[PDB]
């Protein structure tokens with residue numbers, strides 16, 4: 683997989699976290715090909731964020747599924763390669779129902795709201811929907827896929843608001 687899709691940016695680090703301690707933590711969920719704490723070029727003081735690179739996307743998934751991560755005593759904020767919990771799903775036409783969207787998207791994350799859009803005047807389905815999840819990583823996984831097939835339709839999916 684492209685390296686960009688195997689990275690996790692890690693915000694909110696303890697300033698005492700090092701390359702070595704960040705690595706020892708995140709190696710619990712996969713092989714790390716890279717692990718860096720960002721520091722000031724003059725003082726060497728941590729900037730409070732870094733990144734790790736796993737060998738595979740499944741390892742990224744395992745790390746994200748193991749949140750919350752407390753690294754060196756502080757809960758950190760990992761994100762993949764803006765942070766929203768809602769998607770627009772277009773191209774679903776008039777025959778797509780809630781259960782089609784739920785059965786597919788529930789495998790990306792926990793769904794809180796499905797809104798199938800209807801015409802304000804006639805009530806007819808407009809052919810698009812919004813899905814809201816309990817967490818942003820679902821959306822991040824969704825929007826990096828080239829394709830989404832739901833109810834036989836190839837759908838357009840994008841972050842919403």
Ligand SMILES: CC(=O)N1CCN(CCCc2ccccc2)CC1
Pocket residue numbers: 691720731732733762763764
């Ligand atoms: C997906 C996306 O929009 N982005 C991912 C990267 N984000 C910032 C990471 C900055 C960084 C971290 C670690 C080493 C160097 C630099 C913001 C942009």
